[model samples]
Target: GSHMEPARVRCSHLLVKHSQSRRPSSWRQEKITRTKEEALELINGYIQKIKSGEEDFESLASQFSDASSAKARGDLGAFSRGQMQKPFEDASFALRTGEMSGPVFTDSGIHIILRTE
Candidate 1:
């Protein structure tokens, strides 16, 4: 018999939503009004906390992520390639186990991804 587990990633993200004028007017109004640089600075701070072990990914996600998965401690569980948005999926797949990625930009928002496994 031949069996192989599908490749999947267990990851969490901290999202900083910002308004982009190029996007639909409705979308811009729905998110926080901040420059991309501002969002990056904020998420970078959370990354520092994660690196210091002062706060785990879950706590940071709950406090910062605008996504509904925040309730699950930012646990996105596991998924194979192509299950996520292109930029997000690329970042996730590129990471090694227990690695945290740099900021990934998607139409939804800016994400700082952490791969737990």
Candidate 2:
């Protein structure tokens, strides 16, 4: 039998939700109204600052990330395979520690991932 290493990973991300319209209280759905290109433009700008050392990832994430994890500077903590959504899990697993990823699109929104470990 072949042995495989554990899939635990730690990462941080930034998210931007699409604009939404006011709806009836009975309605509980949120829709994505913003285009992927628009989200990419914004994510790229942040990427530039991070890559250039102009801003720390945690600080920018706290200020701009739309995810709940933003309160913890976008820290997603740790997880193994299947714990996260597919696109997010794939991107996270592919990254090496201390590496940053480009914008990855998912149903929720666009994310810029930083794999810390």
Candidate 3:
């Protein structure tokens, strides 16, 4: 191609839910009690380990993530704007590759967004 630009991007992230989250229920938890403050620090360390290969993406993504719906939500499609919420959309579009966002908070919960493009 002579010239091109990305119209959209794809990303996958590990979602952690907090009691303060808009919806405080999940397939795993009947009632979440952990505060968003707790989830913030929880996902904070994971960002470090993930970049170092001390853990794999799927590990946190599947093991602790509340968003089993990651597939339907954002992971399985190439999204650009307006589809996802503010924090997720911001990080997803900003991250180049291999760079996940800071422990971004959304209505869904906290997210560790990883860009694929």
Candidate 4:
């Protein structure tokens, strides 16, 4: 049981939508126009604060994350394989419980992920 994959996984993430994103829009903005590099740069800043404990994941995501999950502290709830973008799904499944991931680039945007289960 210990080494096997879970049927479902839970995660939270902060998404930074860039100009090249599929829709390039969000509740946080009418249209996201920042370049991919800019989004990556911004995510690193968020990660720095998170790593240093200056700010917690929930607060930052809720305040600035581009996804609607931001309203739920970035929580994506529980999901199984194929339910999400391939890159995002792979990264989410790669984590150990309580582990956090670095920038994960997906079609929707870049992400900072936290795997809870």
Please provide TM-scores, in order, for all candidate models, with all chains considered together.
Answer: 0.77, 0.76, 0.79, 0.81
RMSD of each: 4.3, 5.4, 2.8, 2.2
Candidate 3 residue-wise lDDT, 54-108, digit = tens? 8866666766677775334435457768787876777787887666788776656
Model 1 C-alpha lDDT versus the unseen true structure: 0.73
Candidates in order have lDDT scores of: 0.73, 0.73, 0.72, 0.81
The 10 consecutive residues of candidate 1 with the worst lDDT sum are 21-30
Could you tell me which 10 consecutive residues in candidate 2 have the lowest summed lDDT?
20-29
Winner on TM-score (1 vs 3): 3
The lDDT-based order of candidates, best leading, equals: 4, 2, 1, 3
Candidate that would win on lDDT: 4
- Model 1, 1-117: lDDT tens per residue? 583443788877766676663442221234567777787787787778888998888887776666654666777878888777888878887787788987787765777888887
Clashing pairs in 4: none
Assess candidate 1 and give its TM-score to the true structure: 0.77
Report the Cα lDDT for residue 64, model 1.
64
lDDT of 2 by residue, 9-89 (tens): 888887765553132111123344665566677888889999899997899877665566567678787888897789888
Which 10 residues in a row give candidate 3 its minimum summed lDDT? 68-77
lDDT at position 2, candidate 3: 83
Model 2, position 59: C-alpha lDDT score: 92
